[PDB]
Amino acid sequence: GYSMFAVGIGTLLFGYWSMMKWNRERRRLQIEDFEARIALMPLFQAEKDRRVLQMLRENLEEEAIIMKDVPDWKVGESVFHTTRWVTPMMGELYGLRTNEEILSATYGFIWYT
Template sequence: MSMIKLSSPKGGYPEIKWSRNLPRRGPSGLMTILGGVQSNKERRRLRKEQLNARLSLLPLVQAEEDRRILRAMKAFEAEEALIMKDVPGWKVGESVYHTDKWVPPNPAQ
């Protein structure tokens, strides 16, 4: 059996590139943080605007609720007068509660 002699090329083998050479992908960390800060500022501004809009509409909503309560009270008193017309001494609209505290009518009744 003959032996094959292997020898290295003159000047040696070329250098092996072993490190990864991947391109950068996406924004840098600083850009991500700055984007998050801007987003939070915008979200806070919108939340404040929404709160101001709700506070501006609150008197209107309260007035509508007061009108609904007054209509309900008139309807309740009319129904009470019809039901209790045969009861002597009954005063329509008089509170059945033993207090001076305001008790709004229950709309479920």
């Protein structure tokens, strides 16, 4: 009676202690991984900005070519009253590209398993 409860409490406490140590170690490992990501982040930001700007410029050149004969069109006009930079939507960067890469940029992360 008493011995069974003592054994159960003992194994519970041993498991609690082991899991405490392991979870603290896992927290430290996660911090190390997050620090590596933080160190790598600025280069990724620079590359992302360059890529977005290149896509926007290419779309601008193609729009200038296509909409030449349209009477009332203005090439590269904004839809906002403000002159502040606005982050582009997905349809703005891949609007004129093929369906495979459109579907990639839209659903690749969601459909990846």
